[PDB]
Amino acid sequence: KTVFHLGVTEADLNGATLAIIPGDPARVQKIAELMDNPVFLASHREYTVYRAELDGQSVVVCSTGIGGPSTSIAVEELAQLGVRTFLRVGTTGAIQPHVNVGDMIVTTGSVRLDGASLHFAPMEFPAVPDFDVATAMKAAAQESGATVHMGVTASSDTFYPGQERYDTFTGRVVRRFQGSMKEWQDMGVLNFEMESATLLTMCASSGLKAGCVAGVIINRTQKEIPDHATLKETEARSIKVVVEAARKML
Amino acid sequence: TVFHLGVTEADLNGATLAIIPGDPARVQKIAELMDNPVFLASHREYTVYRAELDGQSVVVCSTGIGGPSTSIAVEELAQLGVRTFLRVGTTGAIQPHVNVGDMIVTTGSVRLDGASLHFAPMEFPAVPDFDVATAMKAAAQESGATVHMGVTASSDTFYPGQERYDTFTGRVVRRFQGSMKEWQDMGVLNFEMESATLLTMCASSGLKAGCVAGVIINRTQHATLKETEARSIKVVVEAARKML
Numbered sequence: 001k002t003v004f005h006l007g008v009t010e011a012d013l014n015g016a017t018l019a020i021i022p023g024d025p026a027r028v029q030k031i032a033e034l035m036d037n038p039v040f041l042a043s044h045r046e047y048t049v050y051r052a053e054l055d056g057q058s059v060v061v062c063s064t065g066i067g068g069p070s071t072s073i074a075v076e077e078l079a080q081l082g083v084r085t086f087l088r089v090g091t092t093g094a095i096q097p098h099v100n101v102g103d104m105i106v107t108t109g110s111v112r113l114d115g116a117s118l119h120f121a122p123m124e125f126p127a128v129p130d131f132d133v134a135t136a137m138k139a140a141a142q143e144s145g146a147t148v149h150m151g152v153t154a155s156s157d158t159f160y161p162g163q164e165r166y167d168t169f170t171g172r173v174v175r176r177f178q179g180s181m182k183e184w185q186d187m188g189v190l191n192f193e194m195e196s197a198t199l200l201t202m203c204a205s206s207g208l209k210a211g212c213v214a215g216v217i218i219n220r221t222q223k224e225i226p227d228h229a230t231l232k233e234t235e236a237r238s239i240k241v242v243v244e245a246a247r248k249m250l
Numbered sequence: 251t252v253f254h255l256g257v258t259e260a261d262l263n264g265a266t267l268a269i270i271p272g273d274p275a276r277v278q279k280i281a282e283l284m285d286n287p288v289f290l291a292s293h294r295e296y297t298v299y300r301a302e303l304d305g306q307s308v309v310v311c312s313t314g315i316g317g318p319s320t321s322i323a324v325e326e327l328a329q330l331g332v333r334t335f336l337r338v339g340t341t342g343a344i345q346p347h348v349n350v351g352d353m354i355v356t357t358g359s360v361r362l363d364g365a366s367l368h369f370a371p372m373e374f375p376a377v378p379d380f381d382v383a384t385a386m387k388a389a390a391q392e393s394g395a396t397v398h399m400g401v402t403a404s405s406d407t408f409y410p411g412q413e414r415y416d417t418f419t420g421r422v423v424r425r426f427q428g429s430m431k432e433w434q435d436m437g438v439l440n441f442e443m444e445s446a447t448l449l450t451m452c453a454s455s456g457l458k459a460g461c462v463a464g465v466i467i468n469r470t471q472h473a474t475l476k477e478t479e480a481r482s483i484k485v486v487v488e489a490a491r492k493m494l
């Protein structure tokens with residue numbers, strides 16, 4: 001049948017029960033082309049949807065847009081169409097000293113600084129990935145030859161104050177988030193991003209398997225600026241890792 | 251040059267007012283309603299046009315879905331000198347008396363989002379600037395449409411936070427069980443997904459903002475839709491005129 005936002009049907013998916021879900025529509029086709037017989041399905045707003053084949057099995061690639069709210073729509077609609085496993089892939093900025101540009105982060109849990117996660121489970125509930133998925137992700141990341149870090153990611157509804165940035169129009173951060181950056185750093189949190197709490201919470205409380213893997217393209221604590229080569233490799237590595245992780249899941 | 255929108259202060263040609271629809275696909279149509287529309291940039295869900303309205307530079311910029319993507323657009327536009335933000339959209343009503351085709355101008359939003367808490371504590375009201383609300387009401391009335399001023403419920407999800415049960419799991423978390431009836435009985439007009447974030451971040455940061463929406467469906471009960479779509483963008487451009 002046709003879902004309201006993604007504009008595809010269950011038949012369109014060709015029995016796919018796994019989706020790779022990047023944030024940016026413009027990464028979708030690039031991820032699908034690492035696989036076999038990529039076919040464009042639809043593009044509405046931030047949702048660009050392709051199907052492809054991995055080891056003879058149908059797999060969907062669907063962008064989610066920025067933030068938990070746009071993500072919750074994509075996940076819910078893919079679930080209605082029979083998708084049961086969701087592999088988030090991305091790039092990110094680290095906030096710990098020992099984490100280098102080019103390294104991979106597999107999320108073991110997210111700090112829920114979002115709003116959408118609360119629409120699925122109360123705050124007490126752990127925003128945790130599915131164990132098989134994190135396990136498949138770790139393995140695929142290790143095999144890429146990159147250094148892999150397992151740990152907690154802080155997941156914010158904003159890019160600016162929720163990540164305690166002061167280089168902004170007002171130069172001000174609301175009380176709740178003042179000092180929060182140092183707080184996460186001291187608690188061992190690895191990186192910030194903006195969709196994982198919502199994805200992990202909704203899936204963990206709804207019988208869907210999910211997980212997040214991200215290549216580090218910047219370390220926010222270091223002045224040294226990464227060269228373009230290292231960045232291109234990292235983006236390339238990120239998406240090969242998630243496809244290889246998808247392979248392990250099948 | 252701002253990080254997500256990819257435009258500079260110079261690109262805006264002095265604009266201090268932006269019209270901010272959700273969908274990138276609507277940005278060009280809105281800009282062409284005015285004079286000398288010019289493409290500025292497109293990156294992810296952010297398509298940015300500039301235009302001129304009664305001799306003044308105006309920006310049109312999509313925000314994508316949800317409070318988080320909106321928060322980025324608004325902040326970067328503000329860094330570029332933008333002080334007034336006119337949100338236009340279409341929406342689904344939850345009051346039986348509100349008709350497909352009517353306009354709703356939000357007078358406050360129930361904060362069922364998350365991003366608003368990144369700007370002000372929950373006690374802070376998600377309320378439009380009074381001049382913008384006034385411009386919006388006047389412009390809506392001039393369109394011949396029936397206009398409702400009222401409270402909007404602004405949710406971070408489309409499904410459980412708007413108490414939809416027609417879903418994969420068929421469950422709605424305890425916080426939102428019975429919430430639709432609750433909002434109805436308190437006279438809330440409609441649901442949408444960005445207004446709480448937009449209104450809180452602007453009201454708490456010295457920016458003027460408001461929301462107007464055409465009603466395209468009713469939760470309680472074509473292409474009348476296309477007529478409403480078109481009317482809604484005519485309404486927001488006229489409201490812009492009144493603000494300038």
Ligand SMILES: O=c1cc[nH]c(=O)[nH]1
Nearest residue numbers: 341342412441442443
């Ligand atoms: O019910 C609706 C209809 C349109 N948009 C929403 O956010 N909710």
